[PDB]
Paper text:
The orientation of the lipid fragments with respect to [name] suggests that the hydrophobic lipid tails do not interact with the Fab or [name] and are disordered. The 06:0 PG and 06:0 PA head groups are bound into a crevice delineated by CDRL1 (Leu28(L), Arg29(L), Ser30(L), His31(L) and Tyr32(L)), FRL3 (Ala66(L), Ser67(L) and Gly68(L)), and by Trp100b(H), Ser100c(H) and Gly100d(H) at the CDRH3 tip (Fig 1B and 1C; where (L) stand for light and (H) for heavy chains). Our crystallographic study of [name] binding to two phospholipids PG and PA reveals a lipid-binding site in a cavity delineated by CDRL1, CDRH3 and FRL3. However, the amount of these lipids increases on the [name]-1 membrane that is acquired from the host cell during budding. Interestingly, the [name] light chain displays basic surface patches arising from somatically mutated (Arg17(L), Arg24(L), Arg70(L)), and germline-encoded (Arg29(L), Lys51(L), Arg61(L)) residues in a plane with the bound lipid head groups observed in our structures, as well as with K/R683, the last residue of the gp41 ectodomain before the TM region.
To aid in characterization of the complete [name] epitope consisting of [name] and lipids, we designed an epitope-scaffold that presented the [name] on a stable framework in the [name]-bound conformation derived from previous crystal structures.
Residue numbers in the entry:
A (entry chain L): 2 to 9, 11 to 95, 95A, 95B, 95C, 96 to 211
B (entry chain G): 10 to 159
C (entry chain H): 1 to 52, 52A, 52B, 52C, 53 to 82, 82A, 82B, 82C, ...
The structure:
């Protein structure tokens, strides 16, 4: 990626941050800038030497010097938490284009939001198909990190666990899933299974048992 | 050759010509050859009146009139040398009119050619010996030295 | 008012062919430069190629890793853009975008051929190039629970388990239950198969009357399941 960007950059909410893009081709060509959040189409924020497309907030500006180009977000918002890519020629004088590696901009502060947790026992229908999946759903936590742990009664359980990495909901908080696959014999041969979500010192444990 | 530059695409203009006169005089060879649409000049004029193409460069004032590329049939270039300076509005919004004396009318519709011709114009209009020679030379000489750069 | 909708993406074996479509609306497609961009999984945006307009002779340019295999074309009569891919490899897989392409050149500082920018994008269509084969989902009901919801409300849902590849889509009551629906991003289990859950929150009073059904669709296997979720 001849256009080099920062992997990750953080910014306090309300503060100002500049992401840059460097490459030899920038000595000859301007760059254009795009915001992208997962599940969504990219957004053209800025291009040219001084061009911002209508409908784009004024907090965004691009600039250029030597072999580098940079986007400045003045007064970063919650919505601004996203991926940012630059794009330009790959070589000087090229008819081809290229994208930078992309900068993940996480916006800091914004007050803690605790995770709510929903724990579903394996359905009787699934049990009838000789399988058993415990479904633990985690929602509205911020910031975007949690830790799931499962229990057999009170003993910990590492095998059979699959947990997603957190995902941004529409309200700028985070959601995640963890599933516990076990054989129905295992399901029935214990008194309880527990899904224990830890979020910054705070812990919520949900427990279900074989009894419907 | 991505661009057609013929011998009759170079001409001198008398002192009694206005801005529109220059445009019409320069567009007609392009029209006759069928290089552009047949009312090319009206479009070029309207585009100049909204987005002026006067360039304040020393010592020979330049203007580079054009229109939307959707009016060009094949790439072409038409040059005009003014006998007396004619005022073009300045391409940068400056109050003071450019005393243009060399006019590069561009009839280009290919993007990759447009950028190249503009870059060339930028290079040439900062050569004071060249720009000055364009006044004293004749059509053929003008045609010759410009062609030598294409 | 510009709208671009990619289509035609799906599962394909290495070496195979595939044809992505893009329906363009909201602007002048005919004279518009169009570009294909992809995003490989866990990676960033990547420029695939771009077709120009009339003045440029509908010329097309291609990224090096793709030159010779891919073909970009247009039918301006119905404002469609196309991407013909041959001899695919694993790394050809990702999410494919189409985007309206603008040209930029500053006179006094510019260098030919100036720069191209992407003003309007579509949502993309998913290309999956694997030797692994299509697995359809098993849909299981998550019976109503009230432990974790607001008073009077219960959460019920659907476990959509072990499918490949993405995507799957859930709706409820054929699209009558819009609000209260949360569909969770899938998980990539250690078996290469996906699983996800869709849950909706409902009045606990309607549990004994209003019937609830989730509508699962997994197009890469042509499977459709309608699962009714019920007490107790």
């Amino acid at each position: 990626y001849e256009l080099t960007q920062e992997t990750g950059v953080s910014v306090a909410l309300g503060r100002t941050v500049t992401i840059t893009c460097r490459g030899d081709s920038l000595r000859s060509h301007y760059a254009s800038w795009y915001q992208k959040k997962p599940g969504q189409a990219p957004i053209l924020l800025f291009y040219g030497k001084n061009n911002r497309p209508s409908g784009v907030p004024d907090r965004f500006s691009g600039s250029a010097s030597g072999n580098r180009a940079s986007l400045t977000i003045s007064g970063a918002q919650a919505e601004d938490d996203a991926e940012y890519y630059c794009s330009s020629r790959d070589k000087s004088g090229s008819r081809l284009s290229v994208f930078g590696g992309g900068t993940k901009l996480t916006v800091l502060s914004q007050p803690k939001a605790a995770p709510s947790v929903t724990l579903f026992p394996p359905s009787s229908e699934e049990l009838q198909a000789n399988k058993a999946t415990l479904v633990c759903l985690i929602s509205d936590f911020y910031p975007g990190a949690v830790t799931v742990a499962w229990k057999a009664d009170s003993s910990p359980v590492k095998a059979g666990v699959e947990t997603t990495t957190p995902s941004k909901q529409s309200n700028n908080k985070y959601a995640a899933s963890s599933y516990l696959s076990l054989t129905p014999e295992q399901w029935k041969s214990h008194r309880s299974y527990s899904c224990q979500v830890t979020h910054e010192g705070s812990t919520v444990e949900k427990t279900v048992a074989p009894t419907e | 050759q991505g661009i057609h530059f013929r011998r009759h695409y170079v001409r001198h203009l008398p002192k009694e010509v206005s801005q529109n006169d220059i445009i019409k005089a320069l567009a007609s060879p392009l029209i006759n050859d069928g290089m552009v649409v047949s009312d090319f000049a009206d479009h070029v004029i309207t585009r100049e009146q909204n987005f002026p193409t006067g360039l304040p460069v020393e010592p020979v004032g330049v203007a580079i009139p054009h229109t939307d590329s959707k009016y060009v049939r094949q790439n072409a270039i038409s040059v005009g040398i003014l006998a007396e300076p004619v005022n073009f509005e300045d391409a940068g919004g400056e109050p003071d009119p450019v005393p243009v004396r060399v006019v590069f009318m561009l009839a280009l519709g290919n993007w990759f050619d447009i950028t190249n011709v503009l870059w060339w114009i930028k290079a040439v209009i900062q050569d004071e010996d060249f720009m000055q020679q364009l006044l004293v030379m004749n059509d053929d000489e003008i045609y010759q030295s410009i062609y030598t750069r294409i | 008012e510009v709208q671009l909708v990619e289509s035609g993406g799906g599962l394909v074996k290495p070496g195979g062919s595939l044809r992505l479509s893009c329906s363009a609306s909201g602007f002048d497609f005919d004279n518009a430069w169009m570009t294909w961009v992809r995003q490989p999984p866990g990676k960033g945006l990547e420029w695939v190629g771009r077709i120009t307009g009339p003045g440029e002779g509908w010329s097309v340019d291609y990224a090096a890793p793709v030159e010779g295999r891919f073909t970009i074309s247009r039918l301006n009569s119905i404002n469609f853009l196309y991407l013909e891919m041959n001899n695919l490899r694993m790394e050809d897989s990702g999410l494919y975008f189409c985007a309206r392409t603008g040209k930029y050149y500053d006179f006094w500082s510019g260098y030919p051929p100036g720069e191209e920018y992407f003003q309007d994008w579509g949502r993309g269509t998913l290309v999956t190039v694997s030797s692994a084969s299509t697995k359809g989902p098993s849909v299981f009901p998550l019976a109503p629970s009230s432990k974790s919801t607001s008073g009077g409300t219960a959460a019920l849902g659907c476990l959509v388990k072990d499918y490949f590849p993405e995507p799957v889509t859930v709706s409820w009551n054929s699209g009558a239950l819009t609000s209260g629906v949360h569909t969770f991003p899938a998980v990539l289990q250690s078996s290469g198969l996906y699983s996800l859950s869709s849950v909706v929150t409902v009045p606990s009073s309607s549990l004994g009357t209003q019937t609830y059904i989730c509508n699962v669709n997994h197009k890469p296997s042509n499977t459709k399941v309608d699962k009714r979720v019920e007490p107790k």
